[PDB]
Design a binder for this molecule. Structure first.
Ligand SMILES: Nc1nc2c(ncn2[C@@H]2O[C@H](COP(=O)(O)OP(=O)(O)OP(=O)(O)O)[C@@H](O)[C@H]2O)c(=O)[nH]1
Ligand SMILES: Nc1nc2c(ncn2[C@@H]2O[C@H](COP(=O)(O)OP(=O)(O)OP(=O)(O)O)[C@@H](O)[C@H]2O)c(=O)[nH]1
Ligand SMILES: [Mg+2]
Ligand SMILES: [Mg+2]
Lengths: 18, 137, 180, 415, 180
């Protein structure tokens, strides 16, 4: 863990915008 | 999805309780990925809602739509933006491609009563994108 | 599930309760809290911030959160209203000019949906000079009888003397505690 | 149009100088120190000095003043940018900013200064490029600088492609002594530590209000940053055309975007302070802090600094939660809290004596500021949509990012 | 932590206490201090500055800081009020004209928030001539009974004789010391 907010996985783009 | 199945009955009950017409901050769950719902994911969610019921034929409401989007985000991390309706007046096509749910009139566009209706062709035909090519980029 | 542990705890006293301290500045809030907790009238400076204390009586630990009546501290009572089970209002019967301001502040505070489950607790402070009103004239001026769905009791307490604190505590316990 | 840039010391000795144009004699640096002393003593001291017809602009560094003498009316902003770039390059190459490293790496320092700028025109500004061409422990210049893509060095190979993002939030609240907040601005910071193989072209996507409105999705929580600044690698053409954040990420940690917009929400921490200071007799510190943030968020390492009296002594603290320590160097009491859960209410009661002899002159009323830092909280509600990682070879990236909320200019005017 | 050393020190006497010397000039302050410390009436000049001395009685070292009653020295009592545990007031029962000035000075000094924990210590000085008042007339004139939250005791002492000093010291020790 790490203070200041744990790292989270990020997507590649908005899948709902086509 | 056991969690999705469990949340479907409570979500449907909450949506039915809400009529058709307190804490500040933006907490975020640690390590939970956040991304918009995909076309395949949207199609799967629409199929699950149709099979479980409570989505097709339900009266469209802003509070009910917001509750459904929040439940979807809590259950799968999908952003509550793909469940958008096409601009009116008339039947509002799904905003995100692949979605099987759309809002259609049941009778000013705001005063028009809308009902959610299943649409298999929506997941294959970009009716909303064709209607608003500028909105689709 | 089993509630044997809860019953054992409640057999010798487990309920604690909560309380709040509200009123105008220089209205005996700090002195009243000191008398309730310690038993002596200790001089206190202006309530710039807040005073937090707990009072144990009849096997109930009723925490008291003193709140000042300053202009910069009057709007701060909303923060203290969270996680509060009781509320005590300190009035100044000898301050006719401040009586209207205290009544307006009490009406504004009582007009909050969050502060609805708290019963009325008004203490007739400054009950040592002839200018102090009685337990009915002050209530009539403040319109305590017009508080619908509010259980309020009028008690007169002298800051120098401290009389009436026991009666007010007993009334508050009876209103809050619905057991034998 | 600075004639020459030099690095000075606190004693007036120049740590290092490098002439670029030669239009100003090197002896003018000696007169800079007396001029600075006179300006400081007379209140006329400014970073841009002026020695007759030659201006010696100086910037206060960690240990020395970066004096950049100039002769003509050159680009002052350009000179400041060059000085900032030089400071950043020195910080990257040298971990310490003091006289110890100035006299320890002079051999490489001279080469770096020569390569940085010539004839008053800076030429090299990439720290990685400078390290790939100038080292303290030479080959031909890299082709990345000659090529257009100077923000992504080609040929980088990594075992794993991991990017560490940081959603840094700065909450600045300017609360006046009357209780009204005047300056309430929140500045975002999108800093990503990209460490992958090659030079992938980042395709940034977030829940922006402008982007949602353009795409027709302007109905959810979209962050409308008043000021958004792209990084060096960010392509401004795509952003101007359709807000397309397409750029080559750098090799390492860099700030791609930095949101900056006003805030209209209630403060995360509501602090009420009381000054029950007697007339040379005693002092009262009625400090009450209310956490206006969500209860699900905890402020780690909360340090609310309450300025105590300058001549105050023998203080007694009566608080409920959080350690209170009076720092004689700071001349103030800091309400140190390890973890501050949202909605927490802390009350403090300070009590200390005062000297019998009255003060000769007043000391002012510095504002009270807190050092709260609660991570994993997104107050602005801006949610990143996706990060378009595109590679010609083709690889699966696993970027990571964390949202950190800290207290910036959260200063409350003293009573 | 352990308090064994403190208990051992207090077994044979560890408490010392503090005292202050206040009153009008030529009111027996210097003579009273000399009698308390030494036991004889030693002639002293005007108290331009201050006199500092310590008196050990009943195993308690009560330091005494003499303060003059001069116009230039009357406002200097505020400096001597710091780091002071006791206060002794010297009145002049034979000075009717100066009685009002002494009463006003005592009221001004007692109206200070810093000087609140010090008990009242008034000594009826000049108790050797018929013009000197009694222990009640002087107190009534000075309004000693109107000092709320003040523990004051009226004692009459003659500068030439020194009688009553032991009784005043015992009363001060009883008021300050709350032990056996
Ligand atoms: N002496 C005395 N004071 C009283 C009496 N009734 C009310 N008071 C007032 O109570 C005040 C006590 O001050 P505090 O201890 O600070 O409490 P407070 O009334 O809430 O004042 P603040 O803390 O500044 O809000 C005094 O200043 C008086 O004005 C009384 O019967 N006798
Ligand atoms: N002889 C005599 N003098 C007394 C008596 N009672 C009070 N005094 C006065 O006490 C004074 C003693 O002088 P000091 O030793 O200087 O003490 P003081 O009264 O505080 O005078 P200052 O130091 O100038 O303030 C004499 O001047 C007398 O006026 C008394 O019973 N007999
Ligand atoms: Mg008070
Ligand atoms: Mg004398």
């Amino acid at each position: 863990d790490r203070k200041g907010g744990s790292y989270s996985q990020a997507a590649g783009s908005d899948s709902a915008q086509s | 999805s056991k969690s999705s199945v469990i949340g479907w009955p409570a979500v449907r009950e909450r949506m039915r309780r809400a009529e058709p017409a307190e804490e500040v901050g933006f907490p975020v769950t640690p390590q939970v990925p956040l991304r918009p719902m995909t076309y395949k994911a949207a199609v799967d969610l629409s199929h699950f809602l149709k099979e479980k019921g409570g989505l097709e034929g339900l009266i469209h409401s802003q509070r009910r739509q917001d509750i459904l989007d929040l439940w979807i985000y809590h259950t799968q991390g999908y952003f509550p933006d793909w469940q958008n309706y096409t601009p009116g007046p008339g039947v509002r096509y799904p905003l995100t491609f692949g979605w099987c749910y759309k809002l259609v009139p049941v009778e000013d566009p705001e005063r028009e009563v809308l009902e959610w209706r299943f649409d298999s062709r929506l997941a294959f035909h970009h009716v909303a994108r064709e209607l608003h090519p500028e909105y689709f980029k | 599930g089993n509630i044997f542990a809860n019953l054992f705890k409640g057999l010798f006293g487990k309920k604690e309760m909560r309380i709040l301290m509200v009123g105008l500045d220089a209205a005996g809030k700090t002195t009243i809290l000191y008398k309730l907790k310690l038993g002596e009238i200790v001089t206190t400076i202006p309530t710039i911030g807040f005073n937090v204390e707990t009072v144990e009586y009849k096997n109930i630990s009723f925490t008291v959160w003193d709140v000042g009546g300053q202009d910069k501290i009057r709007p701060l009572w909303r923060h203290y209203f969270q996680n509060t089970q009781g509320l005590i209002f300190v009035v100044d019967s000898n301050d006719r000019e401040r009586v209207n301001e205290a009544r307006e502040e009490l009406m504004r505070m009582l007009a909050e949906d969050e502060l609805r489950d708290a019963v009325l607790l008004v203490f007739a402070n400054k009950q040592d000079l002839p200018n102090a009103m009685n337990a009915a004239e002050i209530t009539d001026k403040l319109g305590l009888h017009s508080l619908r769905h509010r259980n309020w009791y009028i008690q007169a307490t002298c800051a120098t003397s401290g009389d009436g604190l026991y009666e007010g505590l007993d009334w508050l316990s009876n209103q809050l505690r619905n057991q034998k | 149009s600075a004639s020459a840039v030099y690095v000075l010391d606190l004693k007036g000795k120049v740590l290092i100088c490098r002439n670029y144009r030669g239009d100003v004699d090197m002896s003018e640096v000696e007169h800079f120190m007396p001029i600075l002393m006179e300006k400081e003593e007379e209140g006329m001291l400014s970073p841009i000095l002026a020695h007759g017809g030659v201006r010696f602009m100086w910037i206060k560094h960690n240990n020395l003043y970066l004096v950049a003498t100039s002769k003509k009316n050159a680009c002052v902003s350009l000179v400041f940018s060059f000085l900032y770039k030089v400071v950043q390059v020195f910080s990257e190459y040298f971990k310490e900013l003091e006289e110890e490293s100035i006299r320890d790496n002079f051999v490489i320092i001279y080469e770096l200064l020569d390569e940085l700028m010539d004839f008053g025109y800076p030429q090299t500004t990439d720290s990685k490029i400078l390290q790939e061409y100038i080292t303290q422990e030479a080959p031909r210049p890299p082709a990345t600088v000659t090529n257009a893509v100077s923000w992504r060095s080609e040929g980088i190979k990594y075992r794993k492609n991991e990017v560490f993002l940081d959603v840094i939030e700065a909450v600045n609240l300017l609360v006046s002594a009357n209780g009204n907040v005047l300056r309430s601005e929140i500045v975002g910071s999108i800093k990503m530590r990209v460490f992958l193989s090659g030079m992938p072209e980042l395709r940034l996507g977030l829940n922006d209000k402008v982007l949602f409105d353009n795409t027709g999705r302007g109905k959810s929580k979209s962050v409308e940053l008043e000021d958004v600044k792209f990084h060096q690698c960010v392509r401004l053409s795509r952003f101007e055309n359709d807000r397309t954040i397409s750029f080559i990420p750098p090799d390492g940690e860099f700030e791609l975007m930095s949101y900056r917009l006003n805030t209209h929400v209630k403060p995360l921490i509501w602090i009420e302070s009381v000054i029950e200071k007697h007339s040379h007799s005693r002092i009262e510190y009625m400090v009450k802090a209310k956490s206006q943030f969500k209860r699900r968020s905890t402020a780690n390492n909360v340090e609310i600094h309450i300025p105590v009296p300058n001549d105050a002594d023998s203080p007694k603290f009566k608080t409920t939660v959080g350690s209170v320590k009076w720092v004689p160097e700071n001349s103030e009491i800091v309400w140190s809290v390890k973890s501050f859960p949202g909605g927490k209410e802390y009350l403090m009661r300070a009590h200390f004596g005062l000297p019998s002899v009255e003060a000769e002159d007043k000391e002012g009323k510095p504002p009270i500021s807190v050092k709260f830092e609660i991570p994993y909280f997104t107050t602005s509600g801006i949610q990143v949509r996706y990060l378009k990682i595109i590679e010609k070879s083709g690889y699966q990236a696993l970027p990571w990012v964390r949202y950190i909320t800290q207290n910036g200019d959260y200063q409350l005017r003293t009573q």
